[PDB]
Structure 1
Amino acid sequence: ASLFLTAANRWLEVRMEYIGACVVLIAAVTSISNSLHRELSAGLVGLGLTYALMVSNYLNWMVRNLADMELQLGAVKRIHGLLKTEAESYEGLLAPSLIPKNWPDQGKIQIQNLSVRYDSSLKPVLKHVNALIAPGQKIGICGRTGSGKSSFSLAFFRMVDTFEGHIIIDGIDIAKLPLHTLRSRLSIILQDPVLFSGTIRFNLDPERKCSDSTLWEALEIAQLKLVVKALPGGLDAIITEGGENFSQGQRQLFCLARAFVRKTSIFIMDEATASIDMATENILQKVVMTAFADRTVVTIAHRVHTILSADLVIVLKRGAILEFDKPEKLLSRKDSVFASFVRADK
């Protein structure tokens, strides 16, 4: 296709240069026949010869640069097509003075009649759900795959189409909030690990605003301190593109160490323990439940023996709260979906 575009473009400039040579013949014959049997004094005739040669030189460059200007203005058409896109409408309806300086003080996460979608056209993936969360209430969420588990963690940051509801933390409405103030102070950690290339200090803290004692204690409470201190950089060492210098469990563990530098009140997790083994997984649950007493920790369960020592357990099957009770109560009821999930595991 590039040789056919070549031979077509040379066909066009062959016929345009042949038309320009016909211009040189017609203008040359009429400039000698306009001055033989008349008087035109030959400087205008040599002017017409030189500018007729300028027509023959610069006609093919005109049509070549016009077709190249069309093909290069297609790039401006592509960037102008991308440029008038949708914005997320970042500013909220509340004034920023009315939210506190210490906004995440204690977590009264009220949920009433929530139902989400992802856009306008789709089905509701969450059914009508309601919960009342205490600030010392370290809840967990089980379920099946596709039942609304990661969408329930993404609905706290207005990432999905929350078209209704009463998702209000601390008496202040979350839809009436600035989005940088909302997604600053609350911290999710995803299942798929995303790291950025550069250094470890930047990949935990890109502002360089927290201390090295806080980064070393966040690697202490992740258990990656003996891994990174035995590396030849120690700290400020190279993480490459995609995090492919390290393992996938180390990529999830750097996502944990990036989650632990910004302090919180509303630690929410996805299933971050997917690629981690059960030994260091049960080590890391024993640290961060004890190192974070006051902070409300929500975690999507991937292993239910990790989730078994929580305060209350939500069970989300097909987008609805089937169960919201004590884990020993749902274990002793012995027909429940939480009991069959812990029965199918072990």
Structure 2
Amino acid sequence: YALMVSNYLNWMVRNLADMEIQLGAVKRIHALLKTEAESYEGPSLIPKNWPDQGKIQIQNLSVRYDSSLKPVLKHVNALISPGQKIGICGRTGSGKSSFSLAFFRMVDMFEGRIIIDGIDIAKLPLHTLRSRLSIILQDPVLFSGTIRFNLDPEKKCSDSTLWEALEIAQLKLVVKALPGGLDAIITEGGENFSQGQRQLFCLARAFVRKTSIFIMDEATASIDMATENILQKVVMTAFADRTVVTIAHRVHTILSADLVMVLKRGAILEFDKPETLLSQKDSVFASFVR
């Protein structure tokens, strides 16, 4: 036993050090587990189908990214009639992307009321709120796989549906020119598609989602103006019976809309008539910019 333990002593010390290192590993896992405070979703309005009427209204809205930090929005008040195209404009840091993120309850320090057809989050969990709208971002992401997986991960669409969705999104010709049309292998980003094509694929997600409300945060970011004008005309003729709220740094797109609101340093202001909204400002914020 002495000759045995004279070796198993060092062996045992080494094994104990190894266990200590691995247990510190487990400890960092357990420390990672319990952060991310619940922020979880938690049935009277669910049983009734989500209304097609796109009438919405935000009263006295503010927003703060981090708790106890500077406010991003301040005294936000706006209303939107059913089935009408809504335009928003503003400089950098004005709060347009913040407006969109707060429309989805992605910013956890908002104050005010967001009513959608006499319906708000007072009786609805977050899932039915994630299924009620559609959103296109300025930051186009595309995960690897096939074109069917990027266009519809639920795999609940017919091939003619996606072909029509691509022919409407001005993307059919560049899809037909690839091996395995709807089954070409996509890599994460890469050069299989330029920035504009990724934007178009996000637009195609929006097309196939078939919701009642649309959010469009700079679909003009990386698309040529010549193709962008006709693309916006086709996307307006396609989504006629649903509300669309756009934020584009292109002047003409803002011009084509009826109800346009300009975000200010912290606040907004709405205007409707194209001939009245351009001379009421004394031709400062919407005319000379055009």
Q: TM-score, normalised by structure 2?
A: 0.94
User: d(CA) in 2 for partners of 1:152 and 1:283?
Assistant: 27
User: d(CA) in 2 for partners of 1:309 and 1:178?
Assistant: 36
CA contact (8 A) 1:119 1:161 kept: yes
Deviation string 1:55-85 (CA, Å, 9 cap, x unpaired) is: 1111111111111111111111111011001
Using the TM superposition, give the Cα deviation of residue 233 of structure 1 relative to its aligned residue in structure 2, in angstroms: 1.6
User: d(CA) in 1 for partners of 2:235 and 2:160?
Assistant: 17
Deviation string 1:293-342 (CA, Å, 9 cap, x unpaired) is: 11101011210111101111010012201343333322233535542562
Q: Which residue does 2:185 correspond to in 1?
A: 238
Using the TM superposition, give the Cα deviation of residue 136 of structure 1 relative to its aligned residue in structure 2, in angstroms: 2.0
The yes-or-no answer on 1:220 pairing with 2:167 is yes
Q: Which residue does 2:215 correspond to in 1?
A: 268
User: d(CA) in 1 for partners of 2:164 and 2:57?
Assistant: 32
CA contact (8 A) 1:125 1:318 kept: no
User: d(CA) in 1 for partners of 2:258 and 2:86?
Assistant: 6
The verdict on how the C-alpha distance between 1:243 and 1:203 changes in structure 2, with shifts beyond 3 A counting, is farther
* Root mean square deviation, CA, Å: 1.7
The verdict on how the C-alpha distance between 1:64 and 1:243 changes in structure 2, with shifts beyond 3 A counting, is same
Q: Where is the helix percentage greater, Structure 1 or Structure 2?
A: 1
Structure 2, unmatched stretches of 5+, are none
Using the TM superposition, give the Cα deviation of residue 162 of structure 1 relative to its aligned residue in structure 2, in angstroms: 4.3
User: d(CA) in 1 for partners of 2:6 and 2:100?
Assistant: 70
Using the TM superposition, give the Cα deviation of residue 187 of structure 1 relative to its aligned residue in structure 2, in angstroms: 1.1
CA contact (8 A) 1:204 1:257 kept: yes
CA contact (8 A) 1:315 1:337 kept: no
Structure 1, unmatched stretches of 5+, are 1-50
The verdict on how the C-alpha distance between 1:175 and 1:276 changes in structure 2, with shifts beyond 3 A counting, is farther
State the SS of the aligned residue for 1:110. Answer: strand
Deviation string 1:177-207 (CA, Å, 9 cap, x unpaired) is: 2111111231111101011100100111111
State the SS of the aligned residue for 1:242. Answer: coil
Taking only the aligned residue pairs, the percentage that are identical comes to 97
The verdict on how the C-alpha distance between 1:205 and 1:243 changes in structure 2, with shifts beyond 3 A counting, is farther
Q: TM-score, normalised by structure 1?
A: 0.80
Q: How many residues are aligned here?
A: 290
CA contact (8 A) 2:62 2:76 kept: yes
User: d(CA) in 2 for partners of 1:176 and 1:312?
Assistant: 30
User: d(CA) in 1 for partners of 2:18 and 2:7?
Assistant: 18
Deviation string 1:243-299 (CA, Å, 9 cap, x unpaired) is: 542111111111111111110110111112101110111111011111111110101
**Greater C-alpha radius of gyration:** 1
The verdict on how the C-alpha distance between 1:104 and 1:342 changes in structure 2, with shifts beyond 3 A counting, is farther
The verdict on how the C-alpha distance between 1:98 and 1:334 changes in structure 2, with shifts beyond 3 A counting, is closer
The verdict on how the C-alpha distance between 1:336 and 1:264 changes in structure 2, with shifts beyond 3 A counting, is farther
The verdict on how the C-alpha distance between 1:176 and 1:337 changes in structure 2, with shifts beyond 3 A counting, is farther
The verdict on how the C-alpha distance between 1:62 and 1:327 changes in structure 2, with shifts beyond 3 A counting, is farther
Using the TM superposition, give the Cα deviation of residue 90 of structure 1 relative to its aligned residue in structure 2, in angstroms: 2.7
The verdict on how the C-alpha distance between 1:259 and 1:243 changes in structure 2, with shifts beyond 3 A counting, is farther
CA contact (8 A) 1:330 1:338 kept: no
The verdict on how the C-alpha distance between 1:211 and 1:82 changes in structure 2, with shifts beyond 3 A counting, is same
Pick the aligned partner of 1:129 from 68, 71, 76: 76
User: d(CA) in 2 for partners of 1:103 and 1:280?
Assistant: 34
CA contact (8 A) 2:62 2:110 kept: yes
The verdict on how the C-alpha distance between 1:75 and 1:337 changes in structure 2, with shifts beyond 3 A counting, is farther
**Which structure has the higher relative contact order (CA within 8 Å, separation 6+)?**
2
Using the TM superposition, give the Cα deviation of residue 126 of structure 1 relative to its aligned residue in structure 2, in angstroms: 0.3
Using the TM superposition, give the Cα deviation of residue 213 of structure 1 relative to its aligned residue in structure 2, in angstroms: 1.9
The verdict on how the C-alpha distance between 1:80 and 1:337 changes in structure 2, with shifts beyond 3 A counting, is farther
Using the TM superposition, give the Cα deviation of residue 125 of structure 1 relative to its aligned residue in structure 2, in angstroms: 0.4
CA contact (8 A) 1:104 1:264 kept: no
Deviation string 1:206-253 (CA, Å, 9 cap, x unpaired) is: 110122222111111210011101112211111102354211111111
